Design an enzyme around this catalytic site. Structure first.
Site, mmCIF file in Angstrom:
data_model
loop_
_atom_site.group_PDB
_atom_site.id
_atom_site.type_symbol
_atom_site.label_atom_id
_atom_site.label_comp_id
_atom_site.label_asym_id
_atom_site.label_seq_id
_atom_site.Cartn_x
_atom_site.Cartn_y
_atom_site.Cartn_z
ATOM 1 N N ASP A 58 -40.972 -55.178 98.688
ATOM 2 C CA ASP A 58 -40.057 -53.719 98.299
ATOM 3 C C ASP A 58 -39.654 -52.942 99.278
ATOM 4 O O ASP A 58 -40.327 -52.214 100.035
ATOM 5 C CB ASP A 58 -41.099 -53.256 97.479
ATOM 6 C CG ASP A 58 -40.743 -52.164 96.639
ATOM 7 O OD1 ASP A 58 -39.466 -51.660 96.787
ATOM 8 O OD2 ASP A 58 -41.426 -51.597 95.616
ATOM 9 N N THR A 59 -38.170 -53.056 99.484
ATOM 10 C CA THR A 59 -37.531 -52.455 100.703
ATOM 11 C C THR A 59 -37.393 -51.077 100.199
ATOM 12 O O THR A 59 -37.319 -50.185 101.207
ATOM 13 C CB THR A 59 -36.317 -53.012 100.875
ATOM 14 O OG1 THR A 59 -35.568 -52.918 99.739
ATOM 15 C CG2 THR A 59 -36.246 -54.310 101.438
ATOM 16 N N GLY A 60 -37.538 -50.664 98.856
ATOM 17 C CA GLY A 60 -37.706 -49.250 98.526
ATOM 18 C C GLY A 60 -39.077 -48.462 98.569
ATOM 19 O O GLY A 60 -39.183 -47.148 98.416
HETATM 20 C C1 LIG Z 1 -36.306 -50.803 85.504
HETATM 21 O O1 LIG Z 1 -35.872 -50.466 86.779
HETATM 22 C C2 LIG Z 1 -36.614 -49.851 87.527
HETATM 23 C C3 LIG Z 1 -37.875 -49.547 87.370
HETATM 24 C C4 LIG Z 1 -38.876 -48.926 88.314
HETATM 25 C C5 LIG Z 1 -38.250 -48.532 89.352
HETATM 26 S S1 LIG Z 1 -39.282 -47.688 90.739
HETATM 27 O O2 LIG Z 1 -38.476 -46.744 91.345
HETATM 28 O O3 LIG Z 1 -40.617 -47.266 89.975
HETATM 29 N N1 LIG Z 1 -39.999 -48.795 91.671
HETATM 30 C C6 LIG Z 1 -40.544 -49.954 91.022
HETATM 31 C C7 LIG Z 1 -41.912 -50.546 92.048
HETATM 32 C C8 LIG Z 1 -42.801 -49.232 92.056
HETATM 33 C C9 LIG Z 1 -42.417 -51.708 91.424
HETATM 34 C C10 LIG Z 1 -39.195 -49.216 92.986
HETATM 35 C C11 LIG Z 1 -39.756 -48.726 94.163
HETATM 36 O O4 LIG Z 1 -39.083 -49.278 95.311
HETATM 37 C C12 LIG Z 1 -39.931 -47.179 94.349
HETATM 38 C C13 LIG Z 1 -38.490 -46.425 94.735
HETATM 39 C C14 LIG Z 1 -38.646 -44.988 94.771
HETATM 40 C C15 LIG Z 1 -38.588 -44.405 95.991
HETATM 41 C C16 LIG Z 1 -38.872 -42.815 96.038
HETATM 42 C C17 LIG Z 1 -39.095 -42.233 94.958
HETATM 43 C C18 LIG Z 1 -39.112 -42.731 93.499
HETATM 44 C C19 LIG Z 1 -38.940 -44.260 93.608
HETATM 45 N N2 LIG Z 1 -40.890 -46.831 95.636
HETATM 46 C C20 LIG Z 1 -41.863 -46.309 95.383
HETATM 47 O O5 LIG Z 1 -42.500 -45.909 94.203
HETATM 48 O O6 LIG Z 1 -42.360 -45.509 96.505
HETATM 49 C C21 LIG Z 1 -43.479 -45.018 96.546
HETATM 50 C C22 LIG Z 1 -44.738 -46.171 96.798
HETATM 51 C C23 LIG Z 1 -44.652 -46.709 98.286
HETATM 52 O O7 LIG Z 1 -44.665 -45.791 99.286
HETATM 53 C C24 LIG Z 1 -43.686 -44.657 99.091
HETATM 54 O O8 LIG Z 1 -42.408 -45.047 99.366
HETATM 55 C C25 LIG Z 1 -41.309 -44.249 98.886
HETATM 56 C C26 LIG Z 1 -42.377 -43.183 97.827
HETATM 57 O O9 LIG Z 1 -42.345 -41.939 98.550
HETATM 58 C C27 LIG Z 1 -41.541 -41.267 98.467
HETATM 59 C C28 LIG Z 1 -43.742 -44.045 97.696
HETATM 60 C C29 LIG Z 1 -37.037 -48.841 89.594
HETATM 61 C C30 LIG Z 1 -36.068 -49.523 88.917
#
Ligand SMILES: COc1ccc(S(=O)(=O)N(CC(C)C)C[C@@H](O)[C@H](Cc2ccccc2)NC(=O)O[C@H]2CCO[C@H]3OC[C@H](OC)[C@H]32)cc1
Ligand SMILES: [Cl-]
Ligand SMILES: [Cl-]
Ligand SMILES: [Cl-]
Ligand code: NA
Ligand code: NA
Lengths: 99, 99
Positions: A25-27
């Site tokens: 997960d690059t996000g």
């Molecule tokens: C059906 O379509 C989607 C359904 C769900 C998502 S999501 O945004 O919930 N997500 C899915 C995963 C949780 C399975 C994408 C994910 O990359 C998000 C993307 C994201 C990023 C920032 C904020 C909200 C969402 N990252 C995230 O939640 O990061 C959290 C946990 C990991 O450490 C930190 O890194 C960034 C964040 O700290 C700010 C913390 C996207 C599209």
């Protein structure tokens, strides 16, 4: 390997001698795993995602294999809906995004 | 390009005539953009992540330019904390993860 994105980029990880599936997960800044037991002390951390924030347990210097590459680093444990490998460990296995 | 993961993989996008910054996110199935107007029809959807779910508007057949590469697909609009380019559009620009 070269992983395309038509399907979720799920891989096998090994942590605490157990195999699990996790998303590359690059996000994600950080690696977050579903509830399990890990050795050592933990520290508190708050992480924010699409729906709001959760509390997790931060364990440092944990040995974890990811798609057959060894990593040793921080693992967050909490009520995540899927195991996520974030950039802290993607960098340790040498992953890049390419287009 | 080859994007390393030491830092968040942010790029410039153009959507709805507007330039925005967005995260290239392999852990996102779908593309989710902060509240903005888009033309055409939409329908409501719930999407969930860490923290829980948010309600979004689903717009189909929207063109985005992502780091200079054009794509078309579904875009979800709602109260995401950050603009996310998910796999539905990463595939269209040929993005892969490599290690
Ligand atoms: C059906 O379509 C989607 C359904 C769900 C998502 S999501 O945004 O919930 N997500 C899915 C995963 C949780 C399975 C994408 C994910 O990359 C998000 C993307 C994201 C990023 C920032 C904020 C909200 C969402 N990252 C995230 O939640 O990061 C959290 C946990 C990991 O450490 C930190 O890194 C960034 C964040 O700290 C700010 C913390 C996207 C599209
Ligand atoms: Cl780490
Ligand atoms: Cl789509
Ligand atoms: Cl392809
Ligand atoms: Na430790
Ligand atoms: Na449309």
């Amino acid at each position: 390997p070269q992983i395309t994105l038509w399907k979720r980029p799920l891989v096998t990880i090994k942590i605490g001698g157990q195999l699990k599936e996790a998303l590359l997960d690059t996000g994600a800044d950080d690696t977050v795993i579903e509830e399990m037991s890990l050795p050592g002390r933990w520290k508190p951390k708050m992480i924010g995602g699409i729906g709001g924030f959760i509390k997790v347990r931060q364990y440092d210097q944990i040995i974890i294999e990811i798609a057959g590459h060894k990593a040793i680093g921080t693992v967050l444990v909490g009520p995540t809906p899927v195991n996520i490998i974030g950039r802290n460990l993607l960098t340790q296995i040498g992953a890049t995004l390419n287009f």
